[PDB]
Paper text:
The difference map produced by the phenix.polder tool in PHENIX shows for the first time a complete C25 moenocinol lipid tail of MoeADON modelled into the structure. The polar end of glyceryl monolaurate makes strong hydrogen bond interactions with the side chains of Asp184, Tyr196 and the backbone atoms of Pro226, Ser227, Val228, Tyr229 and Asn230. Our analyses also revealed a large positive electron density extending from the bound phosphate ion at the base of the jaw subdomain (His107 to Leu112), along the external surface, connecting to an additional area of positive electron density at the mouth of a deep pocket just below the catalytic site. This deep pocket is surrounded by the conserved residues in what we now define as motif I (Asp101, His107, Gly109, Asp111), motif II (Gln129, Gly130, Gly131, Ser132, Thr133, Gln136) and motif III (Lys153), suggesting its functional significance. The ring B of MoeAJAW forms hydrogen bonds with the side chains of Asp101, Gln136, the backbone carbonyl oxygen atom of Phe110 and the water molecules in the pocket.
PG is synthesized from its precursor lipid II (GlcNAc-MurNAc(pentapeptide)-undecaprenyl pyrophosphate) by the concerted action of membrane-bound enzymes containing the PG glycosyltransferase (PGT) and transpeptidase (TP) domains. The PGT module is found in two different families of PG synthases; as a single domain in monofunctional glycosyltransferases (MGTs) and as the N-terminal domain of the bifunctional class A penicillin-binding proteins (PBPs).
Residue numbers in the entry: 59 to 268
């Protein structure tokens, strides 16, 4: 139930209402590896593109025979639009409208604002529509880098949540399927390759996962 934070997007300022969520946490207030868990898994060149990543997608496709640089179907900006629009059936017309509106979102907002709308208005499972709500509910940890009161979200937990949003009703944190732990393992490897974490952090996280 997140209907209030959804709409038809008559104006892109409708996304500003996500800022009034009680568990809202700004991207600026999160540790880099937390944001990197999502960026690395969903849209590696998030900061560099204008919501479409046409160049990087085309290179990943035709520069190498390997699928090493191939990413998922949607940039974070496209995921923000899809999650702001009311729940609906997935089709090429709705995807096309989302692409169009993503261009309007990129024009108005900076990358940290877009990333804040992303992490505070996507489904993580168990009625959690914010990254802070999810970290609290699942681990009792926090994504606010300034907290002196609460245990800080780990590298592993950040990767678990960044992978979880692809199938939040299916991927189960308590009883992780082989597929879910493969997704998380790949997420940890991408965080390392994209320099959000180091070998120490990576091994500690892989050890904890295993
Ligand atoms: C330009 C051209 C070129 C064309 C031509 C012709 C050439 C032209 C040339 C010329 C002219 C010369 C056109 C091509 C172009 C533009 C590229 C077009 C492409 C076409 C693409 C197509 C075909 C379609 C577009 O759509 C596709 C598909 O869209 P999605 O399905 O939305 O996207 C998912 O898949 C993508 C993918 N396949 O790549 C993805 C990986 O990119 C998405 O990942 C991310 N990160 O976005 C992935 O999204 C996730 O999908 C989950 C659902 O997965 C799907 O589940 C289906 C089953 O229902 C399966 O059949 C699908 O296979 C599977 O993908 C989202 O999770 C859902 O989130 C909801 C909020 C949950 O609902 C809530 O659940 C709650 C609950 O209690 N849940 C529970 C708990 O919490 C615990 C137990 C529970 O039960 C409550 O019940 C509540 O009431 C309820 O509302 C719901 O339960 C939950 N579902 C699951 C399975 O977890 C989850 O929230 C959602 N994440 C986000 C951030 O949006 C697309 O956009 O790619
Ligand atoms: C919750 C009860 C429904 C059974 C499905 C459990 C599931 O996979 O949910 C995922 C869970 O929210 C995360 O750990």
């Amino acid at each position: 139930e997140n209907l209030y934070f959804q709409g038809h997007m008559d104006n892109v300022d409708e996304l500003r209402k996500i800022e009034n969520k009680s568990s809202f946490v700004s991207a600026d207030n999160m540790p880099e590896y937390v944001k990197g868990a999502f960026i690395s898994m969903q849209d590696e060149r998030f900061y560099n593109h204008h919501g479409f990543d046409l160049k990087g997608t085309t290179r990943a496709l035709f520069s190498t025979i390997s699928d090493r640089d191939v990413q998922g179907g949607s940039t974070i900006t496209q995921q923000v639009v899809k999650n702001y629009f009311y729940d609906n059936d997935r089709s090429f017309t709705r995807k096309v409208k989302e692409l169009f509106v993503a261009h309007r979102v990129e024009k108005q907002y900076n990358k940290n604002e877009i990333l804040s709308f992303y992490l505070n208005n996507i489904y993580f499972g168990d009625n959690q529509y914010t990254l802070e709500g999810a970290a609290n509910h699942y681990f009792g940890t926090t994504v606010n880098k300034n907290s002196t009161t609460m245990s800080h979200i780990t590298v592993l937990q950040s990767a678990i949540l960044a992978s979880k949003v692809n199938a939040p009703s299916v991927y189960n944190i308590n009883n992780m399927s082989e597929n879910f732990t493969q997704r998380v393992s790949t997420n940890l490897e991408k965080m390392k390759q994209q320099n959000y974490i180091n070998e120490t952090q990576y091994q500690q996280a892989m050890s904890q996962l295993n």
